[PDB]
Structures are given as C-alpha cells and as structure tokens.
C-alpha cells in the first residue's frame, strides 16, 4: 500500500507552471513535466526541459495541432536526448526542429503506461515513480473557472480527452480523495495553476484513461 498523500512540489520534483499560449502544445508540457520528474528523481537536479524541442521535432505529434505524450517520449528515446529550455526557448508556436546535442538535459529509455480507467495503478504510480502525464476532458466552462476544492462536475465525459497535463501527487482534503495536477495555462489560471481533482469517483474526466510516464 502506497502513501495516503503524496506531493512531489514538497520534494523538489516539480517546476513552475508554465504557460502554453495559443498553441495546443498541452502535450509537450506534460511530457516534460514527467521527464523533469524522472531527471530530479535520478540525478537531484531540477531544471526545465524544452517543450518547445519536442512542438517542433515529435514527426508523429501535429505541434500545435496537439499529440500524444507516449510518441513524444518515443522521440526522447529515438532521438538520443531532449534540450533544455535555456538551449531550446518556449515560442508558443511551431517551427522547424532546431534540437541541438549540446544542451541536451535529459534522456529517456522508453515508457510505461497505466492500464486504462485504473486510478489504483495510477496512485501506486504516482508514489512508485513520481509525476505522471495524463489526460483529461478539460471541455467543461466548470474546469476551465476552478478556484478552490476538490474539482468534480458528472458531464466531464471520460471518453472526450482533449487536455495533457501532469499528476504531481494525490491526497484528501477533508474526507475529498483528489489528484494533484499541473496545468500549463500559466500562474494566473486555477489555484497558482493546479487544479485539485476528484480521485476514485469513477474515473472523474478520464484522468486514469491515458496516463504513462517515461523510462531514465
């Protein structure tokens, strides 16, 4: 059995919230997310990777068309390495791969994902490994206005994912089981940019439907 809370910020693991502009790059933020995970995790630094090298170079990805973080992860391993933002700045929309060997930050061996509609797996993932990528319905006016509290809403469709972003940890916040997500909508959106979401409520907007986090 797996902690009853777990918080990677409390660690170091996780690092500011970012903001993806006009471009449908949610998937490259929560790809880097778990990779910055991973790299603090096997190397006690922290530092920010480029999802910019990943919007430009992911071939199987569409930038800021959106994509998987499963093919992102892929190209990490295939390409040998992703850069760090200081070598490969943020733009907000697509351009030509311009990856650069010489700040590559981290790399990764492959990657695992969670067996669909599972939040028990998901959770001993979480503790076992650390931030994981997920996606999730983030359609509903009711998401996209969160403040406060553990976020449910019974229209958020679990087979209408559209938005990546990553599990930093999970808790109860007085007798509310949640999951703690990182969005990348910037400081400005949500509570400082994390959303708290209701955890073991059936799979509340699919966060257990397409959650994986990469090999290092």
């Given at each position: ?25 949610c998937w490259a933020?929560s ?36 994509g ?96 990546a ?52």
């Amino acid at each position: 059995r797996a902690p009853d809370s777990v918080d990677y910020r409390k660690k170091g693991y996780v690092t500011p919230v970012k903001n993806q502009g006009q471009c449908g790059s949610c998937w490259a933020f929560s790809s880097v997310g778990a990779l910055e995970g991973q790299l603090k995790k096997k190397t006690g630094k922290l530092l920010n990777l480029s999802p910019q090298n990943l919007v430009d170079c992911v071939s199987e990805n569409d930038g800021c068309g959106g994509g998987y973080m499963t093919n992102a992860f892929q190209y990490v391993q295939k390409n040998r390495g992703i850069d760090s933002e200081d070598a490969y700045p943020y733009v907000g929309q697509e351009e030509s791969c311009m990856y650069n060997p010489t700040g590559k930050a981290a790399k990764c061996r492959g990657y695992r994902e969670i067996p669909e509609g599972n939040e028990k797996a998901l959770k001993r993932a979480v503790a076992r490994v650390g931030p994981v990528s997920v996606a999730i319905d983030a359609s509903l006016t009711s998401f996209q206005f969160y403040s406060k509290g553990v976020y449910y809403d019974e229209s958020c469709n679990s087979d209408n994912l559209n938005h990546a972003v990553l599990a930093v940890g999970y808790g109860i916040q007085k007798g509310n089981k949640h999951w703690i997500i990182k969005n990348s909508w910037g400081e400005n959106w949500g509570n400082k940019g994390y959303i708290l979401m209701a955890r073991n409520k059936n799979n509340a907007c699919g966060i257990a439907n397409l959650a994986s986090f990469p090999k290092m």
